[PDB]
């Protein structure tokens with residue numbers, strides 16, 4: 271029938287993890303080392319077919335790869351939800367305080 | 368949170384619902400206390416509460 | 424009162440279906456906010472049935 | 480059920496200020512004498528005759 | 536002679552694409568080994584046409600003219616992207632970035648406002664093959680993306696939206712939801728639009744091309760609450776080609 | 780409830796040593812915070828970048844950790860991004876950019892410790908009000 275696609279995506283791993291394909295950039299503050307440098311690169315080089323494709327962003331330093339490898343457990347990938355990525359909402363989704 | 372709803376007694380006795388739209392619509396009715404089936408068609412009921420003779 | 428009767432039924436070995444199926448529809452219907460006389464409106468005219476419907 | 484609208488159209492008032500015309504042609508402009516301009520001219524005239532009636 | 540902001544402000548010239556003198560009937564040689572770039576693409580719509588909906592199935596579903604009501608806010612400007620020479624000497628334009636959308640509202644005969652997101656977002660437009668020089672006969676033809684006219688944070692007047700807001704009609708706490716479902720459940724559309732840019736004037740020395748365009752896309756569907764209209768947008772374009 | 784020593788004991792560094800502030804340096808820290816920082820960090824948020832606040836749990840996940848006095852003082856000397864990759868003194872107030880942020884000019888080391896103490900104490904007092912924004916007003 272008619273479904274809210276954002277509500278449906280909360281039932282996926284997007285509701286529990288950082289979705290590299292969808293989650294707004296401010297959620298990368300939740301773990302040490304991601305924001306803003308690695309977060310900017312992850313959002314820019316999306317979409318990914320798996321989490322481990324995040325170690326193929328080119329130009330990453332060796333310590334940057336080590337940060338990402340520590341944090342692969344907190345990442346997920348889903349389908350690109352157009353409701354979450356259009357309008358620049360991955361950079362500013364109108365949520366502040 | 369994986370919210371499901373099961374019904375005991377009444378029309379939907381022994382039934383369980385898991386899909387989140389359906390569970391939510393019952394949760395919204397559950398704010399009103401007990402959940403009833405209503406015939407809205409006979410009187411063309413508008414869905415907005417009215418007071419009783421006690422209130423009037 | 425509904426919970427009291429249910430817990431007395433569950434303290435006697437009823438199932439959850441058996442406990443709630445023993446609660447009269449009349450008693451559950453009082454436990455419903457659309458029967459509260461403080462839910463109306465001054466210009467919401469007519470019977471309580473005109474709002475939510477005729478309870479079935 | 481249009482009673483006066485055929486009388487306006489019979490003598491040449493074809494268009495509305497909202498942009499349609501009675502023939503269905505898209506994109507004519509009627510100037511002042513649209514159906515609304517005729518109606519406005521009658522209301523204004525009605526008021527001026529009212530004042531003249533008072534004076535007389 | 537070249538204007539500043541103080542000359543331009545309030546005159547409406549800021550909503551115009553730049554033009555080319557009639558002398559510029561030249562040609563811009565595309566070297567098939569060099570990388571080129573569009574430094575600035577500007578689209579200035581001049582006409583918005585909306586397709587009517589005959590309740591018949593049949594009839595002539597003609598595009599009717601509409602009046603703009605949202606003023607001189609219509610042009611897309613400062614669009615950039617790579618212009619990739621292909622195998623066959625066809626040029627493809629890949630839109631990268633710029634002011635590539637404008638909400639527009641037009642009004643039909645009778646007062647129906649038609650909102651549309653006039654856009655060339657993610658434009659991939661290509662020429663014919665075997666084009667060594669951009670000439671006054673070149674035609675870019677391409678497809679773009681039309682995202683939903685409102686984004687996912689937009690709240691309707693009853694506080695319903697997609698990524699935010701109520702999911703029900705709170706004013707009718709006991710109405711039957713199943714007929715309110717189209718209004719209650721917001722949906723983000725993403726459609727394709729189709730544009731054809733016809734080169735008319737090339738400054739072959741500078742690399743400034745200009746011409747007309749025709750774009751076809753859907754209007755706003757109001758988060759899925761109603762069906763959109765087919766809109767045809769016609770206007771003028773200016774582009775400036777630059778070797779990267 | 781009073782403003783006890785145990786409320787006023789904050790981590791001095793990251794190894795584990797603590798310092799207990801006096802009530803006088805808590806109140807000088809709140810005064811100096813208000814004078815130099817509160818225009819952007821009223822209530823522990825950040826008006827010009829709301830993604831980053833002054834909650835202790837956010838300061839702990841910063842690089843290097845800022846959830847102690849020595850880490851907070853160092854930020855006021857050489858502020859960085861949240862990952863410690865870019866020095867941001869040209870856009871954030873600090874002692875090395877006290878020429879462009881003139882309220883930073885006469886701050887002493889005791890003043891920075893007092894501000895750092897206020898930032899660490901205030902969530903122990905306010906709970907989620909500190910850094911929570913208008914939801915907790």
Ligand code: CLA
Pocket residue numbers: 419420423465466467468469470
């Ligand atoms: C004590 C008097 C009283 C009470 C408590 C009731 C109560 C009821 N009536 Mg009954 N009724 C009454 C007298 C009363 N009635 C009288 C006198 C008549 C004859 C006209 C009726 C004829 C009648 C009919 C035909 C119906 C009812 C119905 C009902 C039920 C619905 C109520 C409703 O919609 O009202 C709505 C109340 C209002 C809209 C309030 C009106 C506000 C007033 C008029 C504003 C006036 C302001 C004033 C001019 C200001 C002056 C300013 C100046 C001093 C400066 C309710 C149980 C209905 C029903 O459900 O029956 C089964 C129904 O169909 N009644």
Ligand code: HEC
Pocket residue numbers: 812815816817818819820825827828831832833834837838841845851854855859860861867871872894
């Ligand atoms: C606005 C003009 C500000 C003033 C005055 C002060 N700060 Fe600030 N602060 C501001 C921003 C925009 C940021 C984010 C910078 C970034 O890109 O990372 C910050 C950050 C901080 C932090 C770090 C917060 C964290 O979670 O790690 C701290 C500890 C901090 N600021 C402290 C601080 C102090 C003590 C100030 C007064 C002297 C002060 N800031 C001034 C904006 C502004």
Ligand SMILES: CC1=C(/C=C/C(C)=C/C=C/C(C)=C/C=C/C=C(C)/C=C/C=C(C)/C=C/C2=C(C)CCCC2(C)C)C(C)(C)CCC1
Pocket residue numbers: 532533
């Ligand atoms: C309800 C209904 C309806 C409606 C109706 C209508 C709408 C009507 C109207 C009507 C009208 C609307 C009427 C009117 C009338 C008027 C008159 C009748 C007037 C008179 C006047 C006079 C009398 C005057 C006087 C004077 C003056 C003022 C001054 C000068 C002098 C003199 C003395 C002359 C219908 C049918 C639809 C349907 C059914 C129901």
Ligand SMILES: CC1=C(/C=C/C(C)=C/C=C/C(C)=C/C=C/C=C(C)/C=C/C=C(C)/C=C/C2=C(C)CCCC2(C)C)C(C)(C)CCC1
Pocket residue numbers: 524527528530531533534535
């Ligand atoms: C020309 C023309 C036309 C026509 C028109 C017409 C038709 C006109 C009319 C006109 C009119 C129709 C007029 C009228 C006038 C009026 C008046 C002028 C009045 C006044 C009055 C007074 C002054 C009074 C007073 C008083 C009062 C009010 C009260 C009581 C007391 C007294 C008595 C004092 C047309 C459009 C077609 C077209 C164009 C042209």
